[PDB]
Each structure stands twice: as C-alpha cells, then as structure tokens.
Design a protein around this ligand. Structure first.
Ligand SMILES: NCCCCNCCCNC(=O)CNC(=O)[C@H](CSSC[C@H](NC(=O)CC[C@@H](N)C(=O)O)C(=O)NCC(=O)NCCCNCCCCN)NC(=O)CC[C@@H](N)C(=O)O
Ligand SMILES: NCCCCNCCCNC(=O)CNC(=O)[C@H](CSSC[C@H](NC(=O)CC[C@@H](N)C(=O)O)C(=O)NCC(=O)NCCCNCCCCN)NC(=O)CC[C@@H](N)C(=O)O
Ligand SMILES: Cc1cc2nc3c(=O)[nH]c(=O)nc-3n(C[C@H](O)[C@H](O)[C@H](O)COP(=O)(O)OP(=O)(O)OC[C@H]3O[C@@H](n4cnc5c(N)ncnc54)[C@H](O)[C@@H]3O)c2cc1C
Ligand SMILES: Cc1cc2nc3c(=O)[nH]c(=O)nc-3n(C[C@H](O)[C@H](O)[C@H](O)COP(=O)(O)OP(=O)(O)OC[C@H]3O[C@@H](n4cnc5c(N)ncnc54)[C@H](O)[C@@H]3O)c2cc1C
Lengths: 461, 461
C-alpha cells in the first residue's frame, strides 16, 4: 500500500480539477485512469461535439451565400477531412492534459481501480494497493443501450461514442431520443446532409426545459428538415441487404396504434440515456451507498456514507455537465485541503447551452418550476420573439425567442430561457447576473448594445 | 402658435424614444423631423453598418470552407445585390417607425425647425409656430470633413454617409481615421475585397480604449490585410485620370518626414469625426449655451441653461451611441411627465461594441482610468489570450484577448475588455453584472458554459 494525501479515481473533468486544486494546496496526489485523460468531455463529448457543430453551422450558412451577394457552391461535404482533424485536436489535448498533471507533480496510476476488502478504505490498481485519507470517486457514466431482450436487434445501433467513430457520413440517419444529445446529433447529421429522423416518445423534445423552448426547438428542428417522429418508439431492428430495417410503433393519443418499418437505415443511434460507471469499483466491499440505478449517493458536501470517500460528476447523477463536475472537485479540494468546512457547490442557477440550430441558452427556473415554488399570483414572465436582423436579407429564417421568469414584487429574475443565433456566447454574462440575484430593474437599468440580439433582454417590456 | 405638452426636435434615436415615453404618460407630443425618421442610426448608421458587417463576416468564412470539408468557391462578390437589400430593409423600418408614432398619437411636424425671437421658448417649422412647456432638442450630429483651405482637395473624398451611397465596391480604398467608424469601414471594405489602407496619425487605432485593445486591434487589422499607415496624414488630394492621388506625410518619431503619393485611389473616406448639428437651430436667440465646437451644454438631468429646453444624444457630445440617446430621452420623459425628480442617466459603465474582425466588447474603466482613480497599489488586472477552438482546424487564425480590471481589496470588477469571435453578443450579460457592482468572486462563483469563449471570463486566474 503506497499512501498518499489524495487518491482520485478517474481522470475526467471532475477528477482532474480536484487533483489539480489539491496539489496546489500541498497534497501529494495521484490519479487513477483506465483510459484516455480528459474523460468523456474531451474524448467523446464537449470537444468533438462542438467541432462537429462548428462544421454543421458552416453547411447552414452555405445556404445564405447568394443572398449575401456571393455565388453559390456545388456542395458535397467530406466527413473524412473534418474527422482526421477533429481526432488530431483531441490528441493534442490529451498530450496537454498529461503534461499538466506532470508539471504539477500529480502521479498517474494507469489502469482500472477497484476497492478492496481492507477495512481502511483502500483501492487496488493492477494487483497493487493504494490508500489515502481522502479518496474521490469521479468515474462518470456511459451511454445506456436497450437489451436485446425487450428490443430484439437493439445492439445493431450505435451511441454517441460510436458517433465519434463514424468515418463517413450516414446516408440515412434515425436517432432515438429527445434530450440534448439526441437533439444535437440530429442537428449535426441533418445539416451535414444525412436524411435524418428523430424518434421521440412524445410530442416535443427537451420536455424538461421551459415550454417555450421545447416548443420552439421541436419546431426549428422540423423547419430544418429533421423528421421528428412523435409518440413513436422502436419495436425491433434487423440487418437487411441495405442497412437496417427499423420497426416502430406510433401511439398518438386519440388514435389506434400503427406499426411502421423504416428501411435502408445506415445509422440507428441510441441517445436514450447515460448510466453511471460504478459496478466494477466493488462499492459493495465498503457498503458505499448507491441509488436503484447505480449512481453513488452523496450529500451537499459530496460525501458518500463512508468516511474519507467522496463522489463528483456524472457518477452521482446530478447535473450532467463538465463545469459542474469541475466546480464540485474544486470546491471539495478546498474543503479538504484548505479546511473550509463550508465549501460546497450551489446546484441552483447552473447555466446550460444546447448546441442545436439555433443554440439554446438557459439558466434558472422554468416558468412552472417558478410557479410551483412561488405561486401563480407571484410569478410574472416577460418574453419576446423576433427574427434576427441577420435574416433581414435571407430567404431562410430562424427565430429568436426569449422568456424571462420573475418572482415576487421586486421581480427577482429567476430564469432566462432563449433560443437563437448567438445564444451560446450570450448566456454566461446573464448567468452571472442571475447568480448575483438581479431583478428586472437591474437588467432594465443596463444600457443596451445596438445592434445585437442580446440587447432584447435589457429592453423587455 | 399651436401649443403642446412636449415638442421634440429631431426624430432620431433620442427624440423618438423620449416622445414615445412621454405620450405613454399622457402628454400631447409632436416630433419635428427634417428628413427620414429613425435618424442617423437607421438611415446611415447602426442598421446599414451591421448589415454590411454580416456580409463581411461571410467573405471571411468563405476562407475556412475547405478546412471544414467543403469545396472552395471561385469568388467575385456583388455589391449591388446586398445594397438593394440593405436599402429595402431601411425602407421597411422607416415605414415601421412612422406607424408607431401614428398609433401612439404623436404628431409629426415635417420640416426644419429653428427657434424664434418670442420670449417664451418657441420654434417655427415652415413659417408656422409651435411652443411647449418642454422642448427637447435631439438633432444629433454629422460627419466632419476637412476644409479645402488646409487640405486642398479634401472635398474630393466621401464620409460614412457617402459610404452607404456607394453602388459598386471601391477597388482601392484609403480611409483616414483611427476611431471605431474608421476601423469598421476598413474592416468591411477589406474583407469584401477592396485594397484597403487605414491612415492614422499614430501607431495604433482606438487609442482611447484599453491598451490591450488598441494593440490587438491594430494587429488583427494588419493580419487581415488592411494596410495601416502610421504617423501618416493627408497633405492634399487630386483627381487624376484613374481615381484620386493622395499625398500624405509620414512623421515617424526618430526619423525625418517623407512625402508619399498614393495613386489610383477610387475611394478616400474621411472618418475623422462627428460635428454637432446645431447652427441653423438659432440657439443664439435664447442664449442657449454650447461649447466651443457647437455641442449644446446640458447638466446631469439633460438641462440646458434655458428653462423648458433640454438636449440629448450626439448633439451634446457625450457618449455617441444610439442606446445612450434612447436612455436619456426615456429617463427625461419620466422626470418631466412622471415627476421623478431623480431620473437621470448614469453615464458610467455604458457598454460598447465595435464590429471589427474580430468584434470588440468593452464596458467600464480601462486599466489606466482605473489606476488613476484608485492608484497602482489598488488595481489588479486579470487577463487571458487564446485561439478559439473554431480555429482548431483552420489555417487562418484570429486571437481572443480578455482583460479584467479590478479595484480595491474586494476586487470590484470595474472594467472588462475583450476582442474575439462572439464578443458582440457576449457583452450585454457582463455589462449587467458590472453594472450591479460584481466582484471577481461573483464571476468566479458562476458555473461555466463549456465549450464557449465566454467561459474564460468566469475562470480567470
Ligand atoms: N481563462 C483561463 C482558464 C482557461 C484556460 N484554457 C486555456 C486558454 C485556451 N487556449 C486555447 O488555445 C484554446 N483552448 C482549447 O484548445 C481548450 C480545449 S479543452 S481545455 C478547456 C478546459 N476544460 C474544461 O472547461 C472542461 C474540463 C476538461 N478537463 C474536460 O473534461 O473537457 C478549461 O478551461 N478548464 C478549466 C480547467 O479545468 N482548467 C483550466 C485550463 C484548461 N485546460 C487546458 C487548457 C489548454 C487546452 N488543452 N479549451 C476549451 O476548448 C475551452 C475554453 C474556451 N475558451 C476555448 O478556448 O475554446
Ligand atoms: N425586446 C423588446 C423591445 C425591442 C423590440 N424590437 C422588436 C423585436 C425585433 N423584431 C424583429 O423582427 C427584428 N428587429 C429589427 O428589424 C429591428 C431593426 S431597428 S429597431 C430596434 C430598436 N432601435 C434601437 O435600439 C435604437 C433606436 C432606433 N430608433 C435607432 O435610431 O436605430 C430598439 O429595439 N429600440 C428600443 C426602442 O426604442 N423601441 C423598442 C421597439 C423597437 N423599434 C422597432 C421594432 C421593430 C423593427 N422596426 N431591431 C433591431 O435591429 C435591434 C434589435 C435586435 N434584437 C434585432 O432584432 O436585430
Ligand atoms: C455526447 C456527449 C456530448 C456532451 N457534450 C457536453 C457539452 O457540450 N458540455 C458539457 O458540459 N457536457 C457535455 N457532456 C457531459 C460531460 O461529458 C460530462 O458530464 C463530464 O464528462 C463529467 O465528468 P466526470 O468527472 O464525472 O466524468 P468523465 O469525464 O467521464 O471522467 C471519468 C474518467 O474515469 C475513467 N474511469 C472510470 N472508471 C474508472 C476506474 N474504476 N478506474 C480508472 N479510471 C476509471 C474514465 O475512463 C474516464 O476517463 C457530453 C456528454 C456526451 C456524451
Ligand atoms: C457610421 C456610423 C455607424 C454607427 N454605428 C453605430 C452602432 O453600431 N451603434 C451605435 O450605438 N451607434 C452607432 N452610431 C451612432 C448613432 O447613430 C448615434 O449616436 C445616434 O444616431 C444618436 O441619436 P440622436 O437622437 O442624438 O440623433 P440622430 O439619430 O442623428 O437624430 C436626429 C434627427 O434630427 C433630424 N434633425 C436635425 N436637425 C433638425 C432640425 N432642426 N429640425 C428637424 N429635424 C432635425 C435629423 O435629420 C435626424 O433625422 C453610428 C454612427 C455612424 C455614423
């Protein structure tokens, strides 16, 4: 047993940041990583996702060329080119992340960690044992897929991970899911040329977002040429001569169900969920708690039920975003190594952006979450809808919707939701303001920047 | 003399908003406009400027096409097309602005107003007389041009107004000026294909901005192919067989001066200044104060030295931006018609964006204005510089610089300056935060949005 001051399991967003902050404070740390550092985000997430998005944004502006006075292009995108490059960038970052750990004196135990029987919290990487007064489990999660039992042929399709392995553009794409990943994959594949279909169990996507967003987002998808199959779901999948044959059942309320075969499908992508990566950790040896789905149960301070063990990031289940994982590891490191008993992450007013077309920006309470916590009498919402002046000279259009949810008489801005061009870089600023507890008066007392879309939030009447 | 409750002179940004807010409060208002409503901003400013910018942004992304897997285009932009459209949009807006005044019951005295001899403040539009207990002068300004006396041939060139009259792209462009307009014109003409030169009296542009900006902005201009002629200035201009011949004098400190002839110049654009539009108003009949340059002198409440007369917008000289003009007319209307003695506009922390390539965003104190008002011991600046991941796969690059100026021990964020992709839509949010009096801790306690450029401001260390 080599002893350390900190032993982080998983070198993803959460593990790395916590280790970095701990080392900065004096601790002798080591990180246990079974694969590539940078985790899900760098290797199969944020990074490669956003590169492919910047590419989709390009095809969509090839369509506005002639309107702007330029001669139009003949087409034919090449997936290989942009893939080789996307992959290279991910290599450049790995190298970078290795270097940082090294120059920071953070040891890297490479391999798969699992807990042991030793009473004192101890893990064992490759027959060898390591222990520490503080162990952070930050192993994340993975895309869930349906068992061949209920969906015979389910394994025939791919996941987001497999999307980043695609080497040529799928001719016919069918995506099953209604969350941000699902939406993003559908938006990228469709803009780049694939005949795409998004299969959802209901009528709208991102149903957990403010109604104005799920409504607008389902619409803009339809308007962009993505076939949305509502109240539909996969019954089975089969490999035919030319691609897969997907049989789905559509049960639109008020009507009788209908079976449908989607043939010649090159790509069936499961974007149905993320499952925690916790079995093989041998949590059962310490009685470490988990919920019915395997997520590790922690408290406000990221504490498991076992002393000297913590969990952060996706593995916990709450707020599946890289900067939440980071913020939690950073705050933990400070509580442990800088002794600030009160360093926890406030999970309220976390900003999120969904890179669809147009981009979605959202922070805070939805109108309903607001109505519920305050009451209809005390919730006033303000909102606008317009066509960005960028579309003033284009046949093509996309709208821009902005809702502002205010609570009580002072009108504390408790939620801002929007969808439109520029909404991705537009949010961080207001997120700070919302986090400071701004009121509608503060926004209104801020001089506008003309001409911009952002200026519509400081002139909402 | 027809009497009203409010008589606004000029239907631009400031006059229109003040009239609208006044009418909403009960006042019987009328607006006096000698030309097209919407003013400088709609007719020869913000609106047409930003359309031409969106177009320049397009040529600059035609250059990243092949990098993103798409086949490249043969070129040849067409100025006519985008002009007909830009002009049409401006017509659509005028019509809109007319309609609003009408549906709001604001009368429109069309023609040129001038003050009279009548003791009681009275103006006369076309032989007819109008008076009111409250007159707002919101006549704005105009591009200044050099007198043929000192610069023989100065009149041969055009101004920003004349830029919006151009019907074909200038082959060779030379722009004289170092402010935002100058920079923007140079950036648009150059991106769209003109062989451009920007003539400045010093070494850098936007010299009144934070040093990191004038430095970065002079650099990115050079890197984009805009020839910047430093310590240079026009001596005279002449019309030759093929375009104008510009003779300038370059006096770089440490060296002897050199005369230079720039020949074959199709366009010489004066972007040297804006002069107030106040002579023909006959200010002298009421003894209304003005500075040595004709700007009308007002106080914190927009009061002239004469009772019942006010001034807002460019005409005053302070903060030459549409939303400052608007904010001042709106606040005035409330002071006058809603009787709130304390409604004045706070001229501190006004956000501004300069649509160069890449866009500049800035709000607050520059490092020096901070150092001066607080002292070197009390000013801490934070800053970063990086290449946006959009350029991770492009031969072409543009940087992104961000400086954060903090004052005192709490580190109140008193100034944020940046230049880069997305910085135009990125600013409004932080401007609200800065206006609320945020500290570096507030920014740091805001969860980041990954991956974005905006996220670099909440992780500045
Ligand atoms: N504002 C100053 C602080 C930010 C410094 N970035 C350097 C300037 C960019 N230079 C450049 O030349 C361009 N930058 C990039 O190449 C990298 C790629 S991923 S690196 C971005 C990084 N990651 C996270 O946000 C997510 C956690 C991550 N481990 C994961 O799982 O993905 C972040 O900033 N971490 C805070 C922290 O943990 N670490 C901080 C350092 C980031 N790690 C690597 C930086 C260099 C890139 N490998 N940065 C990003 O894409 C995000 C930042 C964005 N501004 C951008 O640059 O596009
Ligand atoms: N968030 C709700 C409040 C904003 C409402 N805009 C309508 C939604 C956009 N719909 C759409 O379909 C697209 N909008 C546009 O066509 C117009 C063109 S100029 S109109 C923008 C306007 N002007 C000023 O900022 C500058 C003063 C001006 N008189 C000048 O001199 O230029 C502003 O919002 N004024 C506050 C106020 O005085 N008046 C408010 C109404 C604006 N006047 C005209 C609106 C319709 C366009 N004619 N708006 C803009 O370009 C700026 C807003 C920006 N979000 C955008 O839409 O691009
Ligand atoms: C497609 C797709 C797109 C996404 N886009 C975004 C986005 O734009 N923005 C965003 O904020 N988030 C995005 N996410 C979410 C983000 O990837 C995750 O929330 C973030 O990765 C969480 O970090 P973590 O520290 O819990 O995990 P991870 O990054 O998953 O890191 C865990 C690491 O632990 C290693 N590991 C696991 N078990 C062990 C073990 N026993 N021993 C050793 N090593 C082990 C893993 O190999 C991995 O490298 C996306 C996710 C997917 C999938
Ligand atoms: C090129 C260029 C680009 C610009 N870009 C931007 C930008 O992106 N953002 C921004 O914020 N600002 C920009 N500006 C600045 C913005 O145009 C002005 O600050 C804004 O127009 C100020 O409004 P105002 O009410 O004082 O004036 P104005 O809009 O100028 O309105 C005054 C009106 O008064 C009328 N008038 C004048 N005298 C009389 C009289 N005696 N009788 C009757 N009518 C009269 C005029 O014809 C005019 O229509 C730009 C300016 C130029 C020039």
């Amino acid at each position: 047993v080599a002893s350390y001051d900190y032993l982080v399991i998983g070198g993803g967003s959460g593990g790395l940041e916590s280790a970095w902050r701990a080392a900065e404070l004096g601790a002798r740390a080591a990180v246990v990583e079974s694969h590539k550092l940078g985790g899900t985000c760098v290797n199969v997430g944020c990074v490669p996702k956003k590169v492919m998005w910047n590419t989709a944004v390009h095809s969509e502006f090839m369509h506005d060329h002639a309107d702007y006075g330029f001669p139009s292009c003949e087409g034919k995108f090449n997936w290989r080119v942009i893939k080789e490059k996307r992959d290279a960038y991910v290599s450049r970052l790995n190298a970078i992340y290795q270097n940082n750990l090294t120059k920071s004196h953070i040891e890297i135990i490479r391999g798969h960690a699992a807990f042991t029987s030793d009473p004192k919290p101890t893990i064992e990487v490759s027959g060898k044992k390591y222990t520490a007064p503080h162990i952070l489990i930050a192993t994340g999660g993975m895309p869930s897929t349906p068992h061949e039992s209920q969906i015979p042929g389910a394994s025939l399709g791919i996941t987001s991970d497999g999307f980043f392995q695609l080497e040529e553009l799928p001719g016919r794409s069918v995506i099953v899911g209604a969350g941000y990943i699902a939406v993003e994959m559908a938006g990228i594949l469709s803009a780049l040329g694939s005949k795409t279909s998004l299969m959802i169990r209901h009528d709208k996507v991102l149903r957990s977002f403010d109604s104005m967003i799920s409504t607008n987002c389902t619409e803009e998808l339809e308007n962009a040429g993505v076939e949305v199959l509502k109240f539909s779901q996969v019954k089975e999948v089969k490999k035919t001569l030319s691609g897969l044959e997907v049989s789905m059942v559509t049960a639109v309320p008020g009507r009788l169900p209908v079976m449908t075969m989607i043939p010649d499908v090159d790509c069936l992508l499961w974007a149905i969920g993320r499952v925690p990566n916790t079995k093989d950790l041998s949590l059962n040896k310490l009685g470490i708690q988990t919920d019915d789905k395997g997520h590790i149960i922690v408290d406000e301070f990221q504490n498991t039920n076992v002393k000297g063990i913590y969990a952060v990031g996706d593995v916990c289940g709450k707020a599946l975003l890289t900067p939440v994982a980071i913020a939690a590891g950073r705050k933990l490191a400070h509580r442990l190594f800088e002794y600030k008993e009160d360093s926890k992450l406030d999970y309220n007013n976390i900003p999120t952006v969904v890179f669809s077309h147009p981009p979605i920006g959202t922070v805070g309470l939805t109108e309903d979450e607001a109505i519920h916590k305050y009451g209809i009498e005390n919730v006033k919402t303000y909102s606008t809808s317009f066509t960005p002046m960028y579309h003033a000279v284009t046949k093509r259009k996309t709208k821009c919707v902005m809702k502002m949810v205010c609570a009580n008489k002072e009108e504390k801005v408790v939620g801002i939701h929007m969808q439109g061009l520029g909404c991705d870089e537009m949010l961080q600023g207001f997120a700070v303001a919302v986090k400071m507890g701004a009121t509608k008066a503060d926004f209104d007392n801020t001089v506008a920047i003309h001409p911009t879309s952002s200026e519509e939030l400081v002139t909402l009447r």
